[PDB]
Design a protein around this ligand. Structure first.
Ligand code: PIO
Ligand code: PIO
Ligand code: PIO
Ligand code: PIO
Ligand code: K
Ligand code: K
Ligand code: K
Ligand code: K
Lengths: 332, 332, 332, 332
């Protein structure tokens, strides 16, 4: 009866455990994780970094002010010039650190030509400042631009159907584009998922078996404007070959459907997924047409996308029987 | 007689309606939309964000100035130090907010060490400032760099022709590069569009049928320097197999041509398209050569690109007849 | 005798003329051109933009200062507050414009709360400022990162050779990686270039004919660490099938070799090219091995890369003859 | 006995020498190198650039201050206005240079309307400033984002095994994903590495021979969630065809395994590698299942990933013998 390996939203149902090296391997790939975490976390993270550099330098400057004796003479006089003007304490040293690294530079607190170490520190802090910004930009740039978001404007039919097209019995499901932007170099893939035991007695917890959508003839490549109906012809080499309408309400297995393509604007490949259980496949049905001609253009009614209608003319046996039977009649 | 599913510019003629979830699905993919809108909109949008953060913080600062009693003593004295110097009112609080977030920091209005909340607010606003900038950069970066713009320096012939090459009857159309930059890993695809009814009585509003350009042999991949003429050999497995010159002025259908490749500079796939109606296909014609040798290099005259000439030697029947007839003569 | 369509550096020898729409099509694709121009031009271009916005706003501010009467009272007094402090003339108005847009904000020239138009202008200029920066970043980012630069660390043999390998006569040329960085998902392509006339009497100025490197079997995909020798087996379906050693010093044609792959760091496809004329192909030679085992690793001597040695055992006739002859001996 | 061409981490064991043009070819591709060097080097490099521009301009400003006579009158008076206020010497000129290029602009040192050359210099320095930043961003952006880092969250089995599946003798190794992020458009490749001599007596130091993973049928493409076991069927066309269990402890050769795919977030192809020596291949073993059903989802125990168990039922001869023998029994 259960269960489902890929959910309908495409989300995969599985978890990794006892991975061992996970910590040290994630440090090297660390950038990859950083961009998948919630915004608030990536942000708080960066503000944490800012805050830390501001405090660090602030301390240096305050230390410098303390030792130089600026805390007691922040503004100096004819006989005395402070390292950095107007640093009277911690908060003052803090403010100056921020003003410097942010490049606001109000100027009320200001470096003088006196201390080479203060000057140096400012130099270092400036450079540092650029570095952190650069990381933030890249991170934000990257995360903002993730192509997996496009998979949410792509659509699969809630069900898959089996039915005759041009003398052949075919498993079909539908796909559609919810944006007027194109999916470039798009193509599809399908797989039958279920556990099995090889004739040698080897148990495969879940075997993934290719469902042929026409890859060989280059037919898995699609041009997607209006919703396309995807066809798997069930034949000798099909994993569904010996399955009939009654085997559908009995058998336990899963079909996984994939759509890969490039977001038109960024040319970044996105991968959309969904799944049909044997109990989500409608035998003897056909998809309702979503496309019609309004005279000087075409329109797509998306409310008909998921809808199917009964075709009582449809055979209830397997392709296998269907074929075999043909060769009794034709054989006699 | 009508109509056309893809226009000649490649623009697709169709519209989506009754999409349902459109709003909630567009929010998750929201970045994808943001980059396709007109510049002025993306910009005004960002300036809207800036303006909003400036006003927001300005209010905070003004509120802080008001309560602290700075509005009445903006410059302070020996006994009194304001939260932020020189904020006498709304506009002053506004100016300071901008100066801070932009990092101009003229310094006439300046934070003091007095209020931790003012200090904090400045901290927050600074961080915020970086965040908005980062988004703007990414957005601008992205939109500026869109690869679909390259499709406008790529070219299709205004017409397609049918004619004999090396003993075979072929549908041909032409493609060309208008930049001296290359289209990397380029390849082509073709499809016949028209409504049809399966032998089972199923209506397909528009069926998309592959036109073989040599995909199987890897011949759909092209190296495009000078204009290339693309050939579809019309044979047993061709959708045009049973079509003759007279069927061209009668029949209603459409041929869709695609060119996919990578912009040399960004290596981002662009997809160019165009279309030929049965009435835009010239039977019995041939393309005028645009390439000639000037002795130590080659030149392309692009004014000859679209031009075709009559070949009266050309057969007016279908490949089907042509073949079948060959097997009467050779059969007798 | 001449000439060469692709030079040895990969540079293509051809020019486009009479393109017509070139100007209006380049405006839409305008970004693509901007990144291919020399640095100095892209830079001067941007500094031109900066300079133009600084001058524009400077004028506005100066106009505002003039009308308000600030030019005569730049510092104001108890009874008079200028729009922007310390603007006494053109250069002053200019300096302030720059200080504002650059966010330096020394603060000597500073906006006051008086003029909403000055304030507004500052607002506008700030926003504008960000916009130009963003473009510069993207442009610089893009151009700096162009993948076509990697093609200069990729290498082709100065000559191609023909010779026997495992009982088959093969055209071979060599390729090599000059960086320890990998070329990801790399593959090769070859083509024979030369003008020809179809049996129908149609002249093709230059026909491009695929040279099979094993694409069908997936053998055109290579893993390139040490230099690889690329093999074209000359057989029935080869365009070189009927060519012998003597036809090489006579015939005029060209072979074009391509290597496509992804720069490991940016995963951006680069395309490297080179060319062999019939007179650059060495019949009866073999490449000198550049790889040898030094015991706990391997080394590549690149000075042997281009070198070839004579194999007098090599047949001087065409594959065609070679085959045909085999079937006399075996036929008698 | 030795040695290994690709290490187990994927690192390649080889070195390039006598490359000749290496310096001039690396200058054109210079960006590619810059991003592979250690952070500290790329950073120090950039800080070097900053420091150099600060010093350069500082000198100009100091020169200008010197000649104008500002060094003796940094603050000016009613009758005298300095080029740049408050530059009394070298360090002062330095500080101002930094303040300007960084856009901090404290304002204590400030340009006046007096010198057009000082003004000009500031203009130039500002523009320059933007330029360097832009490069730093791009560099940091790029390097931070390198897709080769993802290959460290991808996994190969420590050993490869040979064993029967569904009546066929197969070489198998395992692959797994250590992140819950997907590897998009992933596919695999395998190759047998070893030196050989063609029947013509030509020595190939290392020949790379394709191991068929199902490329022809499109089966080399995988959907990787849980660890997949990769199968090479050993048959007539297999390079391992004539190899038996005893040939494994004798022969010296290497098998190289590759996994190519796209980092889900950036859609940038990464290439992962590893290697199995004839002595790292376990004949007669089978992989321990890492996947099991916990009722409403699936889990992967990664500690079982590398583990194999003995299958005494396994034949010790080559596929060749195995086949040939079948045709004695069936032949008699
Ligand atoms: C002030 C700072 C406010 C602040 O810290 O975050 C607010 C907001 C919400 O982010 P938030 O923390 O809710 O993070 C996202 C949230 O979990 C969504 O529900 C996820 O969408 P989905 O359900 O997985 O589809 C999304 O997944 P993914 O994107 O990680 O995959 C998460 O990133 O972040 C912005 O959008 C940009 C704001 C820019 C200003
Ligand atoms: C001052 C602010 C002035 C301002 O707000 O915009 C002006 C200008 C025009 O932009 P605009 O609003 O006209 O937006 C573009 C306009 O619709 C074009 O005609 C479209 O080209 P096409 O016909 O579809 O090919 C283009 O399509 P797409 O690009 O969206 O696909 C639109 O983006 O924007 C800049 O170019 C960058 C200026 C940077 C300064
Ligand atoms: C001060 C401003 C100085 C300034 O304006 O440019 C100097 C310098 C030279 O640039 P330059 O004007 O010489 O432009 C490059 C020059 O033509 C090279 O010879 C070309 O290489 P190749 O022969 O085609 O391989 C290259 O081709 P492509 O790259 O266009 O294809 C051209 O871009 O530019 C920088 O490198 C970055 C400097 C950052 C500071
Ligand atoms: C203060 C300045 C401190 C400073 O200069 O660098 C510190 C730190 C270390 O960098 P570091 O110099 O150690 O450089 C990396 C180091 O060699 C790693 O061990 C390498 O990893 P792997 O073993 O090859 O996997 C990595 O290889 P690749 O990445 O080059 O391939 C090297 O880049 O750099 C940051 O991470 C970003 C810090 C941002 C702040
Ligand atoms: K500033
Ligand atoms: K200032
Ligand atoms: K600033
Ligand atoms: K400032």
């Amino acid at each position: 009866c259960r269960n489902r390996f890929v959910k309908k939203n495409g989300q995969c149902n599985v978890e990794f455990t006892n991975m061992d090296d996970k910590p040290q391997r994630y440090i090297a790939d660390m950038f990859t994780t950083c961009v998948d975490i919630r915004w608030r976390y990536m942000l708080l993270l960066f503000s944490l970094a800012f805050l830390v550099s501001w405090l660090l330098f602030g301390l240096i400057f305050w230390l410098i002010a303390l030792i130089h004796g600026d805390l007691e003479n922040p503004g100096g006089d004819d006989t005395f010039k402070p390292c950095v003007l107007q640093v009277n304490g911690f908060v003052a040293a803090f403010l100056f650190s921020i003003e410097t690294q942010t490049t606001i530079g109000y100027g009320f607190r200001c470096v003088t030509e006196e201390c080479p170490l203060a000057v140096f520190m400012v130099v270092v802090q400036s450079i540092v400042g650029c570095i952190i910004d650069s990381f933030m930009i890249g991170a934000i740039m990257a995360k903002m631009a993730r192509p997996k978001k496009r998979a949410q404007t792509l659509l699969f039919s809630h069900n898959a159907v089996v039915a005759m097209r041009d003398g052949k019995l075919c498993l079909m499901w539908r796909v559609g584009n919810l944006r007027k932007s194109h999916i470039v170099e798009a193509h599809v893939r399908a797989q039958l998922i279920k556990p099995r035991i090889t004739e040698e007695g080897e148990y495969i917890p879940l075997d993934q078996i290719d469902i042929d959508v026409g890859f060989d003839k280059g037919l898995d490549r699609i041009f997607l404007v209006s919703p396309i109906t995807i066809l798997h012809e069930i034949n000798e080499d099909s994993p569904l070959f010996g399955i009939s309408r009654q085997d559908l309400e009995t058998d336990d297995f899963e079909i996984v459907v994939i759509l890969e393509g490039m977001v038109e604007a960024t040319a970044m490949t996105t991968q959309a997924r969904s799944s049909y259980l044997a109990s989500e496949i409608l035998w003897g049905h056909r998809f309702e047409p979503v496309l019609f001609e309004e005279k000087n253009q075409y329109k797509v009614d998306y409310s008909h996308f998921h809808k199917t209608y009964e075709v009582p003319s449809t055979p209830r046996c397997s392709a296998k029987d269907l074929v075999e039977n043909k060769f009794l009649l034709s054989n006699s």
